[PDB]
Amino acid sequence: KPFCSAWPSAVVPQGGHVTLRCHYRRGFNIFTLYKKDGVPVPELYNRIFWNSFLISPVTPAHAGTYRCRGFHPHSPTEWSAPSNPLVIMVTGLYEKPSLTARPGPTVRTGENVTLSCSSQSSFDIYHLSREGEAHELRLPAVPSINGTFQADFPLGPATHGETYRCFGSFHGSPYEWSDASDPLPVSVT
Amino acid sequence: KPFCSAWPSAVVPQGGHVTLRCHYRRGFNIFTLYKKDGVPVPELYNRIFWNSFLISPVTPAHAGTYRCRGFHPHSPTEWSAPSNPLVIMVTGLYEKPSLTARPGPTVRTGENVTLSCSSQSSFDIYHLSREGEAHELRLPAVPSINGTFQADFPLGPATHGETYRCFGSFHGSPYEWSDASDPLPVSVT
Amino acid sequence: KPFCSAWPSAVVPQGGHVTLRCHYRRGFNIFTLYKKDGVPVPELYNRIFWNSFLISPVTPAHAGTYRCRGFHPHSPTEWSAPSNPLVIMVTGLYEKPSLTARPGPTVRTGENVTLSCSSQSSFDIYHLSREGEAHELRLPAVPSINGTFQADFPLGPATHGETYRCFGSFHGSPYEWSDASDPLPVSVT
Amino acid sequence: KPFCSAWPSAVVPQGGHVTLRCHYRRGFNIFTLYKKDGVPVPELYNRIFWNSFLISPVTPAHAGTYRCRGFHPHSPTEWSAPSNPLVIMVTGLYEKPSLTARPGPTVRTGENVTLSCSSQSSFDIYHLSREGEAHELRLPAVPSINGTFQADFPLGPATHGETYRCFGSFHGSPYEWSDASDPLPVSVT
Ligand SMILES: *[C@@H]1O[C@H](CO)[C@@H](O)[C@H](O)[C@H]1NC(C)=O
Ligand SMILES: *[C@@H]1O[C@H](CO)[C@@H](O)[C@H](O)[C@H]1NC(C)=O
Ligand SMILES: *[C@@H]1O[C@H](CO)[C@@H](O)[C@H](O)[C@H]1NC(C)=O
Ligand SMILES: *[C@@H]1O[C@H](CO)[C@@H](O)[C@H](O)[C@H]1NC(C)=O
């Protein structure tokens, strides 16, 4: 199967651009796109591209999972197995959620830290992201006694200083994210 | 991942200039630029640069968060991991807030100093910066008569003499700052 | 260079359908499409296809001249030379001209037959096509009372019986044709 | 030096698109663009691109000669020699010239054929193009006793059937071409 990455970023703001770049050593660098998740995009249905494919400008419809088969002319199907799943995320669609820290943004080593995303928007899911990590954490949003939709991320004992932002998303659109929270720098002393 | 910095300062006055610099040890100093909080200005759109890159004059449209990947030819992605956050803040957009100290400009060593940023403008976030330390503090504004918005930065024990300034910014654009407040030098006896 | 053809016909009625086909012996049947007389319709913009490609329904925006390069991976350009001209003409846009024969529908073998296309419309170019022969003839229109535009196609000696039709087209759009004239069968005794 | 080609066509209609694709075996596929001829384009001045560079939409300012240096980090200049000159042509800017044949579009083998481009537009140069040949012929436009600017291409004795089109261009813009002539099919019997 081919190796497909997003350049320069899989996480792209609304109105931005992204290039789906694929490489295939077995066969040739002629690929066919496949959008698995997200809003249906007809102009992406069985679309054949060379080396790379430029999505611009990026709309909320482009958020979702993509896969690519490489041209392998001397195989039974003349096309290869699907590539690695490539998830494209679109941000800056809804109001940004507020991010706060318990007990506070500054705590000692070995102390449990728990972040909270809050919003007046009826987000179904909250996505916490840390600067440095590409692995995003996602938790369901639960209503509070204030009229806000909230989720609490328990990070556990502190090991080193980090910086967090969070996003909100409605049902049926997990990759269509809101504006990012203001950066919350967790300092570990 | 590459090391990116803004020079002479990430906090750059409108009409001023800034240089996006980056250095990459593991590979080659060919860097691709991308903005995370919105679509970039045209001369920053699809921008790959060599070593450093000069922006002049600086406009409000340059304010935001940026990342860079260094050229890593012999890797799956042919590019490095996202660099350290490359933030650009533009000042001089709104009238400067007033900065006051508590208990005052001169204080005893080990005593608590609290700096209040206050304006008639309806800022959402005040930012307290210090001379010599490229580390800004963020706080939300609060209403209080006489029809003013205010934020109190408690710095804890005062160890050494330090001069401060503060900027006002509105809710939808946290990287677009007001004119700098008059400098407040705190002396420590 | 690849061989490209339109099927069932390059002369295709508006609202009708056409299939762009191509075959490439020297390399692979992966073809890139491009229009030479203007920017292409969106589903033809950045269009790479496998073997053949179906257009339905056909709109006036599809009319024009096209080329195709077959996939030639192990060459400097990684693509072939431009194919044979792939022309699309759309009919049914204007009222049909009237087609007349000289001396008439039935003629002696070896005699000269001249076909006049005539309309009240101010066409710039008349196009004479024949049933069975995928080769159209082009001629400019000429003013003459009763306030009509006309073109005379001299076919020379009449060898065999053949049915003709003609289309009118205006100066700025030579690939956008009128409705077909009533068929004129020429008999040869 | 790198090998740089235009995809899918160096000859691109106004409002169209073209991709400057470069390959470099010695060093890496990081290139820097250079526009030698044509109208000055600042956003193309020392612009660094990866693998390919997409010009879209194409304007008359993009017509001209391009060269590319490849990234060769362990060389005295860290960049290589300029690539092959890549001429990009923009068509469909002015009215199309008329193309006629002397003595006629149909002649016997070994007969001298001479084409003529005519126009009411003050073209300084006429460019004859043949279907199949990438080599364009250019002749200066000379005024006639009719008020038209004309040029005569003497092709000499006929060898095989061909198809010709022609373009017109004004002074100082040799690669900014008009609309193509109607195709003139020279038949050789
Ligand atoms: C963090 O939570 C875990 C689980 O309840 C607990 O075992 C641990 O003692 C806590 N750490 C601190 C510093 O409170
Ligand atoms: C001074 O600040 C320190 C740290 O912020 C705090 O522990 C202390 O209680 C404060 N004292 C007063 C009098 O506010
Ligand atoms: C008939 O047509 C042929 C070829 O076009 C021409 O040589 C001949 O002179 C014509 N005869 C008449 C009577 O028009
Ligand atoms: C074509 O022109 C050349 C040069 O004048 C001449 O030698 C030749 O005989 C001409 N051919 C014909 C068929 O007239």
CA C8 to chain centroid, in Å, comes to 12
DSSP C91-146: E-SSPPPEEEEES-SEE-TT-EEEEEEEESS--SEEEEEETTEEEEEEEE-EEETT
CA A109 to chain centroid, in Å, comes to 30
Q: Does D48 touch chain A (CB under 8 A)?
A: no
Cα of D101 from ligand 1 centre, angstroms: 93
Please give the Cα distance from D154 to D142 (Å, whole number): 15
Contacts of B46 in chain D (CB under 8 A): 49
Give the residue from A77, A70, A5, A64 showing the smallest Cα distance to A36: A64
What separation, in Å, do the N-terminal and C-terminal C-alpha atoms of chain B show? 43
Q: Does D7 touch chain C (CB under 8 A)?
A: yes
DSSP helix/strand/coil, B165: strand
Please give the Cα distance from C170 to C123 (Å, whole number): 5
Q: Considering only alpha carbons, which residue of chain B is nearest residue D44?
A: B43
Contacts of A49 in chain C (CB under 8 A): 46, 48
The CA–CA distances, whole Å, from A84 to A2, A21, A42, A44 equal 7, 12, 21, 17
Q: List, in order, residues 6 or more apart from B33 with CB less than 8 Å away.
A: B20, B40, B44, B47, B48, B49, B53, B66, B67, B68
Torsion of CA B172, B176, B178, B184, to 10 degrees: 110
Q: Does A50 touch chain C (CB under 8 A)?
A: yes
The CA–CA distances, whole Å, from B80 to A7, B45, B67, D39 equal 11, 19, 11, 36
Q: Does A174 touch chain B (CB under 8 A)?
A: no
Determine, for residues A43 and C48 on separate chains, whether the beta-carbon distance falls below 8 Å.
no
Cα of C168 from ligand 3 centre, angstroms: 26
Torsion of CA C114, C119, C124, C128, to 10 degrees: -40
Residue C32 zone, left/alpha/beta (φ > 0; ψ -120 to 50; rest): beta
- B abuts A (3+ Cβ pairs < 8 Å): yes
Please give the Cα distance from A32 to C166 (Å, whole number): 42
Give the residue from C102, C159, C94, C105 showing the smallest Cα distance to C127: C94
Three-state secondary structure of A135-179: CCEEEECEECCCCCEEEEEEEEECCCCEEEEEEEECCCCCCECCC
Minimum CA distance residue for ligand 3 atom 2: C156
Neighbours of D135 (CB within 10 A): 7
Give the residue from A81, A84, A99, A88 showing the smallest Cα distance to A65: A88
Cα of C112 from ligand 3 centre, angstroms: 6
Q: Are the beta carbons of A70 and A80 closer than 8 angstroms?
A: yes
Please give the Cα distance from C174 to A140 (Å, whole number): 61
Q: List, in order, residues 6 or more apart from B107 with CB less than 8 Å away.
A: B113, B158, B186, B187, B188, B189
Cα of B155 from ligand 2 centre, angstroms: 9
How far does D31 lie from chain B, in Å, by closest CA?
10
Q: Are the beta carbons of B88 and B7 closer than 8 angstroms?
A: no
Q: What resolution in angstroms does the PDB record give?
A: 2.8
Rg (C-alpha) for chain A, rounded Å, is 20
Please give the Cα distance from D70 to A145 (Å, whole number): 62
Check pocket membership of C75 for ligand 3, CB cut-off 6 A.
Answer: no
Backbone dihedral angles phi then psi of residue A43, each to the nearest 5 degrees: -75, 5
Nearest-ligand number for the alpha carbon of C156: 3
**DSSP H/E element including C167:** strand C162-169
Rg (C-alpha) for chain B, rounded Å, is 19
Please give the Cα distance from D22 to D6 (Å, whole number): 9
Please give the Cα distance from B22 to C186 (Å, whole number): 79
Q: Does B28 touch chain D (CB under 8 A)?
A: yes
Please give the Cα distance from B75 to B24 (Å, whole number): 15
Three-state secondary structure of chain D: CCEEEEECCCEEECCCCEEEEEECCCCEEEEEEEECCCCCCHHHCCCEEECEEEECCCCHHHCEEEEEEEECCCCCCCECCCCCCEEEEEECCCCCCEEEEECCCEECCCCEEEEEEEECCCCCEEEEEECCCCCCEEEECEECCCCCEEEEEEEEECCCCEEEEEEEECCCCCCECCCCCCCEEEEEC
Strand segments (E) across chain A: 3-7, 11-13, 18-23, 28-35, 48-50, 52-55, 64-71, 86-91, 98-102, 106-107, 112-119, 125-130, 137-140, 142-143, 149-157, 162-169, 184-188
Neighbours of B1 (CB within 10 A): 16
* CATH 2.60.40.10 residue spans of chain C: 1-91, 92-189
Q: Which residue has the tokens 């002369």?
A: C11
DSSP helix/strand/coil, C35: strand
Tokens coding A62: 């482009």
Cα A15–Cα A17–Cα A21 angle in degrees, nearest 5: 160
Q: How was this structure determined?
A: X-ray
Contacts of D51 in chain A (CB under 8 A): 51-52
DSSP helix/strand/coil, B13: strand
The CA–CA distances, whole Å, from D24 to B72, B80, B121, D84, D183 equal 16, 21, 57, 12, 38
Nearest-ligand number for the alpha carbon of B107: 2
Determine, for residues B38 and A92 on separate chains, whether the beta-carbon distance falls below 8 Å.
yes
DSSP 8-state secondary structure symbol assigned to residue C179: P
Nearest-ligand number for the alpha carbon of D156: 4
Determine, for residues D52 and A52 on separate chains, whether the beta-carbon distance falls below 8 Å.
yes
DSSP helix/strand/coil, A61: helix
DSSP B137-152: EEEE-EEETTTEEEEE
Q: Does C75 touch chain D (CB under 8 A)?
A: no
Which of C42, C43, C49 is opposite residue A48, by nearest beta carbon?
A: C49
Check pocket membership of B114 for ligand 2, CB cut-off 6 A.
Answer: no
Q: Does D45 touch chain B (CB under 8 A)?
A: no
Give the residue from C92, C91, C84 showing the smallest Cα distance to C36: C84
Q: Which residue has the tokens 């102009």?
A: A43
Residues touching ligand 1 (Cβ under 6 Å) are A 110-112, 157
The CATH code of the domain at A1-91 is 2.60.40.10
Neighbours of A148 (CB within 10 A): 19
Q: List, in order, residues 6 or more apart from B138 with CB less than 8 Å away.
A: A182, B125, B126, B127
Neighbours of D75 (CB within 10 A): 13
Q: Does C3 touch chain D (CB under 8 A)?
A: no
- D abuts A (3+ Cβ pairs < 8 Å): yes
Neighbours of A115 (CB within 10 A): 24
| Single-letter amino acid code for the residue at C84 | N
Determine, for residues A7 and B79 on separate chains, whether the beta-carbon distance falls below 8 Å.
yes
Q: Which residue has the tokens 């006429």?
A: D126
What subunits touch chain B, counting only 3 or more CB pairs under 8 A?
A, D
Determine, for residues D52 and A51 on separate chains, whether the beta-carbon distance falls below 8 Å.
yes
Please give the Cα distance from B63 to C27 (Å, whole number): 50
Residues in chain D: 189
Cα C2–Cα C4–Cα C6 angle in degrees, nearest 5: 170
User: Could you tell me whether strands C11-13 and C86-91 are parallel, antiparallel, or unpaired per DSSP bridges?
Assistant: parallel
Which of D29, D48, D73 is opposite residue B49, by nearest beta carbon?
A: D48
Cα of D185 from ligand 3 centre, angstroms: 22
Instruction: Please state the CATH superfamily assignment of the domain spanning residues B92-189 in this structure.
Output: Immunoglobulins (2.60.40.10)
Please give the Cα distance from A155 to A162 (Å, whole number): 11
> How many contiguous H segments (helices) and E segments (strands) does chain B have?
0, 17
DSSP 8-state secondary structure symbol assigned to residue B180: P
